[PDB]
Amino acid sequence: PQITLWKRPLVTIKVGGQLKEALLNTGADDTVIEDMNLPGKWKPKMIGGIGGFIKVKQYDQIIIEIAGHKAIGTVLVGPTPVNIIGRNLLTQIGATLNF
Amino acid sequence: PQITLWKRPLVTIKVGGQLKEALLNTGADDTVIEDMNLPGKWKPKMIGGIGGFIKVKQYDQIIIEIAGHKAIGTVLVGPTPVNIIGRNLLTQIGATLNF
Numbered sequence A, B: 001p002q003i004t005l006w007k008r009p010l011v012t013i014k015v016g017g018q019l020k021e022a023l024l025n026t027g028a029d030d031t032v033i034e035d036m037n038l039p040g041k042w043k044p045k046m047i048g049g050i051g052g053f054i055k056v057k058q059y060d061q062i063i064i065e066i067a068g069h070k071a072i073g074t075v076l077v078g079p080t081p082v083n084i085i086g087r088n089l090l091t092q093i094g095a096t097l098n099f
């Protein structure tokens, strides 16, 4: 697909057996998903952007499907205002920026 | 060009006549640049990011060149951690996401 940027580039994802809406985000390497009760080991992390930092849980090797494309990698879970798919998983689904 | 996402999609911009580095950011509605002297009238505004809200100076109708492509639009100036080119200008240079 080609996604123009008039509107937020939102897609459906599947993670932890749940469907969610998420924003395709070239602005960070990591993926951040809103609080959800994912099973297994995690490590505390703090990530910072406009407005400051939030505390998240870093989960590794999380299976996540993005607009019908399978991926697996690190997923940060925490009180982000918007689910954001970062460059790490964008590369796995073959996403590029074009102009 | 076509830009893959293994690395941060950083480009050189020119704004207020000065060269700077900035991040092409599909996860940003708006363009936010670190504090700088910029010619033009501005209006006080607030914007929210992952960590909360900040005050910015809103400059409308600003000439800005992005990786050699011309845009004229709204540039927010304030305490962002990274210069970011958001969708308001990415659309002007005809950027799309593709996978």
Ligand SMILES: CC(C)CN(C[C@@H](O)[C@H](Cc1ccccc1)NC(=O)O[C@H]1CO[C@H]2OCC[C@H]21)S(=O)(=O)c1ccc(N)cc1
Residues within 6 Å of the ligand: A025, A026, A027, A028, A029, A030, A031, A032, A047, A048, A049, A050, A081, A082, A084, B025, B026, B027, B028, B029, B030, B031, B032, B047, B048, B049, B050, B051, B081, B082, B084, B086
């Ligand atoms: C500021 C960037 C360098 C980094 N961010 C990604 C960025 O794309 C966020 C992604 C984002 C998107 C929506 C809400 C919160 C965060 N967008 C953002 O802050 O944009 C702001 C400018 O335009 C406005 O439109 C959206 C918010 C405003 S970030 O969300 O803060 C972030 C920071 C660190 C990590 N590890 C992961 C993500």
